[PDB]
Every structure is written in structure tokens, then in C-alpha cells.
Write an enzyme that holds these catalytic residues in place. Structure first.
Site, mmCIF file in Angstrom:
data_model
loop_
_atom_site.group_PDB
_atom_site.id
_atom_site.type_symbol
_atom_site.label_atom_id
_atom_site.label_comp_id
_atom_site.label_asym_id
_atom_site.label_seq_id
_atom_site.Cartn_x
_atom_site.Cartn_y
_atom_site.Cartn_z
ATOM 1 N N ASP A 78 0.857 -1.191 0.000
ATOM 2 C CA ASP A 78 0.000 0.000 0.000
ATOM 3 C C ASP A 78 0.893 1.240 0.000
ATOM 4 O O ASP A 78 2.084 1.162 0.306
ATOM 5 C CB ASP A 78 -0.945 0.015 1.212
ATOM 6 C CG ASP A 78 -0.203 -0.082 2.536
ATOM 7 O OD1 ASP A 78 0.301 0.938 3.027
ATOM 8 O OD2 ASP A 78 -0.103 -1.200 3.081
ATOM 9 N N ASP A 119 -13.547 7.951 1.080
ATOM 10 C CA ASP A 119 -12.588 7.716 2.160
ATOM 11 C C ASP A 119 -11.223 7.296 1.640
ATOM 12 O O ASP A 119 -10.612 6.335 2.127
ATOM 13 C CB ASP A 119 -13.120 6.658 3.145
ATOM 14 C CG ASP A 119 -12.246 6.517 4.387
ATOM 15 O OD1 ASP A 119 -11.663 7.531 4.853
ATOM 16 O OD2 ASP A 119 -12.154 5.391 4.916
ATOM 17 N N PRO A 122 -3.869 6.817 2.018
ATOM 18 C CA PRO A 122 -2.726 6.001 1.600
ATOM 19 C C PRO A 122 -2.933 4.501 1.790
ATOM 20 O O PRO A 122 -2.473 3.709 0.978
ATOM 21 C CB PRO A 122 -1.586 6.559 2.444
ATOM 22 C CG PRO A 122 -1.978 8.050 2.551
ATOM 23 C CD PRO A 122 -3.444 7.932 2.889
ATOM 24 N N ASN A 124 -5.548 2.700 1.309
ATOM 25 C CA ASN A 124 -6.292 2.016 0.257
ATOM 26 C C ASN A 124 -5.836 2.339 -1.164
ATOM 27 O O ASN A 124 -6.578 2.147 -2.129
ATOM 28 C CB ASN A 124 -7.822 2.172 0.410
ATOM 29 C CG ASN A 124 -8.277 3.606 0.554
ATOM 30 O OD1 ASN A 124 -7.761 4.509 -0.104
ATOM 31 N ND2 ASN A 124 -9.289 3.813 1.396
ATOM 32 N N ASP A 137 -11.723 -0.030 -2.783
ATOM 33 C CA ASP A 137 -12.907 0.348 -2.000
ATOM 34 C C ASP A 137 -13.827 1.461 -2.529
ATOM 35 O O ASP A 137 -14.646 2.013 -1.785
ATOM 36 C CB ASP A 137 -12.485 0.614 -0.544
ATOM 37 C CG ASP A 137 -11.946 -0.639 0.148
ATOM 38 O OD1 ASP A 137 -12.028 -1.743 -0.450
ATOM 39 O OD2 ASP A 137 -11.441 -0.540 1.294
HETATM 40 N N1 LIG Z 1 -6.381 -5.466 -2.348
HETATM 41 C C1 LIG Z 1 -5.432 -5.327 -1.379
HETATM 42 N N2 LIG Z 1 -4.212 -5.908 -1.487
HETATM 43 C C2 LIG Z 1 -3.430 -5.624 -0.408
HETATM 44 N N3 LIG Z 1 -2.176 -6.096 -0.323
HETATM 45 C C3 LIG Z 1 -1.147 -5.732 0.577
HETATM 46 C C4 LIG Z 1 -0.134 -6.732 0.867
HETATM 47 C C5 LIG Z 1 0.955 -6.460 1.773
HETATM 48 C C6 LIG Z 1 1.061 -5.179 2.417
HETATM 49 C C7 LIG Z 1 0.084 -4.154 2.161
HETATM 50 C C8 LIG Z 1 -1.009 -4.418 1.253
HETATM 51 S S1 LIG Z 1 -4.193 -4.638 0.757
HETATM 52 C C9 LIG Z 1 -5.592 -4.580 -0.206
HETATM 53 C C10 LIG Z 1 -6.820 -3.781 0.218
HETATM 54 O O1 LIG Z 1 -7.825 -3.736 -0.677
HETATM 55 C C11 LIG Z 1 -6.944 -3.055 1.411
HETATM 56 C C12 LIG Z 1 -7.546 -1.713 1.418
HETATM 57 C C13 LIG Z 1 -7.673 -0.965 2.639
HETATM 58 C C14 LIG Z 1 -7.212 -1.518 3.884
HETATM 59 C C15 LIG Z 1 -6.604 -2.847 3.951
HETATM 60 C C16 LIG Z 1 -6.157 -3.368 5.210
HETATM 61 F F1 LIG Z 1 -5.265 -2.492 5.816
HETATM 62 F F2 LIG Z 1 -5.522 -4.596 5.051
HETATM 63 F F3 LIG Z 1 -7.223 -3.559 6.060
HETATM 64 C C17 LIG Z 1 -6.485 -3.593 2.698
#
Ligand SMILES: Nc1nc(Nc2ccccc2)sc1C(=O)c1cccc(C(F)(F)F)c1
EC number: 2.7.11.22
Length: 282
Positions: A78, A119, A122, A124, A137
Site C-alpha cells: 500500500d 474515504d 494512503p 487504500n 474500496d
Molecule cells: N487489495 C489489497 N491488497 C493488499 N495487499 C497488501 C499486501 C501487503 C502489504 C500491504 C497491502 S491490501 C488490499 C486492500 O484492498 C486493502 C484496502 C484498505 C485496507 C486494507 C487493510 F489495511 F488490510 F485492512 C487492505
């Protein structure tokens, strides 16, 4: 799980825990989000139709055992982690420009389809090894409707307006653009009033001249302190004039005056945009 195998917890999302999981039948790795309403199911399901290179794909909506899960394509990292990782040297300007350009393309696409995020932050915004950045999202806020980060919240939301517009996403993106540049959050408020007053101390307390109708907003108080606007060159110092002009248009108080994602894509700041490869440590 019956249809998946959890690899690990990725983090806490707005609506519930997000796991890195593997599809039992296909072996594909995905981001599985547990959602902590029939209208919601139908609405979110429509989002599976969105397809754009700068939007994290919603692969499926699973409603089983009276539990709701959303399956999203899995990305590498992210933007919050990437910014933290790039804190000592900063994200190269060409990459900041590439990411901002791509994010605007994603917003332009969603907004043209009448879908808002509401919303953006960084956390998302997700990146991959190839230089792409995607927003995850979009549309969930409208479908689900309500520590929370307030740093990227548009002023009209903080002032209690219950009607959202595409402009709330442009505001959030402007805040993120500023943060990539300076390596520090632009408005790190710790409460709604602190968030609002941090915006006012920097951009000046809004009035009817710059924002017609502001004094009639739900939570506006005539007692708000009146701060003068700070010189924009002091807010994101490194940034050149094209970058500063674009940022100023993304941070106008009146959502109606805020630049659209489509118009922003044509801004001179992107005249020399490229698509650099980021140095990602996975
Ligand atoms: N598609 C998707 N791939 C992700 N890979 C990833 C792998 C390793 C480190 C950071 C992100 S994260 C993600 C989310 O869509 C997402 C969006 C908002 C919040 C979060 C959470 F923080 F995990 F709650 C996750």
C-alpha cells in the site's frame, strides 16, 4: 474456510478484517474482506462490473452462512507503507507524478460511472512492482453507510454536509499528493475540530466570498477563529509552480470550484509524465 485458506491478516479495514487468502479451487491469491442489508448486496454487486487499470478489481461478493465477504485482487504493497519506506530519501518526483496521474485516471473513470470513494487514504492506494497504482474500496461508503483517520477528509464533510460529491475524492487526493511531496501528512488532525482547524490555519478560515454557502453548513459556527491563509509556497516547498497550481485547485474550499479528475489530467503538471519503476521491498 470452506472456499479459501487464510495466508495471514493484512490489517484492519474500514468494515472489518482484511486477509490475504488463497482460493481453494483456483489457487489464486486474493484480499478477502469480512464485512462486519439486501440493498447493500445488490449495490456492491454492481461494482464487480467496474474494470479499469487503476482500480483494484472487486472479484466477487460472497454471501454465505449469513456473513458477507468481498474478494479483491491482491496487490503488492500500500502507499502508506511505501511512503514510510521512502521516508529517508523521498519518493522521486517522476514517480509521484506518475502515481498522481494514474490515481486521477482512476477517479475520472469511477466518477464518470457515478461512483464515489469518500474515504481515500494512503492505506487504500495499492501499488505493484510494475509502476502501477490502484484505488481500492470505491463505492463501499455509499453502499454500507458508516481509530478513524480524518486526515484526508474534505471540509464539507467535517462541517456536517450529508450530501457528497466527486469533489470529496479530489480533496483527499490533493492531501495525499502533498504528503508524497513533503513526506509529512498535510493536515494530521486528531479530532474532527482539530482536523478542521488545521485546514483553516493553513488555507485560511473560509467565508462566504471563497465558499458561498459555507456559513449555513450544519456544523459551521460563527465563533470559529478567523485565520489568515498561508502563502502556498510554504505548504509544499519542494514542489514547482505547476505542482503547486494543480494542488491549489484540488484544495479549493468550495467543492464546486475544486478541479475535476478529468480536468486535472490535462493540467500542465503532467506534460512530461512518465511511468517509472518503483523500488519495492516485499
Ligand atoms: N487489495 C489489497 N491488497 C493488499 N495487499 C497488501 C499486501 C501487503 C502489504 C500491504 C497491502 S491490501 C488490499 C486492500 O484492498 C486493502 C484496502 C484498505 C485496507 C486494507 C487493510 F489495511 F488490510 F485492512 C487492505
Amino acid at each position: 474456510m470452506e472456499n479459501f485458506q487464510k495466508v495471514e491478516k493484512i490489517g484492519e479495514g474500514t468494515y472489518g478484517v482484511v486477509y490475504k487468502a488463497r482460493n481453494k479451487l483456483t489457487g489464486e491469491v486474493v484480499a478477502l474482506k469480512k464485512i462486519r442489508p439486501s440493498t447493500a448486496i445488490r449495490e456492491i454487486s454492481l461494482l464487480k462490473e467496474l474494470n479499469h487499470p487503476n482500480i483494484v478489481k472487486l472479484l466477487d461478493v460472497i454471501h454465505t452462512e449469513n456473513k458477507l465477504y468481498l474478494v479483491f485482487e491482491f496487490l503488492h504493497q500500500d502507499l502508506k507503507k511505501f511512503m514510510d519506506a521512502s521516508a529517508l530519501t523521498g519518493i522521486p518526483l517522476p514517480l509521484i507524478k506518475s502515481y498522481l496521474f494514474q490515481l486521477l485516471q482512476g477517479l475520472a473513470f469511477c466518477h464518470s460511472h457515478r461512483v464515489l470513494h469518500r474515504d481515500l487514504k494512503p492505506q487504500n492506494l495499492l501499488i505493484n512492482t510494475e509502476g502501477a497504482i490502484k484505488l481500492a474500496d470505491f463505492g463501499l461508503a455509499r453502499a454500507f453507510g458508516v481509530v478513524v483517520t480524518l486526515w484526508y477528509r474534505a471540509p464539507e464533510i467535517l462541517l456536517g454536509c450529508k450530501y457528497y460529491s466527486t469533489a470529496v475524492d479530489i480533496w483527499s487526493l490533493g492531501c495525499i499528493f502533498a504528503e508524497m511531496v513533503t513526506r509529512r501528512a498535510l493536515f494530521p488532525g486528531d479530532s474532527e475540530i482539530d482536523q478542521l482547524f488545521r485546514i483553516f490555519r493553513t488555507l485560511g478560515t473560509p467565508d462566504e466570498v471563497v465558499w458561498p454557502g459555507v456559513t449555513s453548513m450544519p456544523d459551521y459556527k460563527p465563533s470559529f477563529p478567523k485565520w489568515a491563509r498561508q502563502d502556498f509556497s510554504k505548504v509544499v516547498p519542494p514542489l514547482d509552480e505547476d505542482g503547486r497550481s494543480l494542488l491549489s485547485q484540488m484544495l479549493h474550499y468550495d467543492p464546486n470550484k475544486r478541479i475535476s479528475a478529468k480536468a486535472a489530467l490535462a493540467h500542465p503538471f503532467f506534460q512530461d509524465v512518465t511511468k517509472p519503476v518503483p523500488h519495492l521491498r516485499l
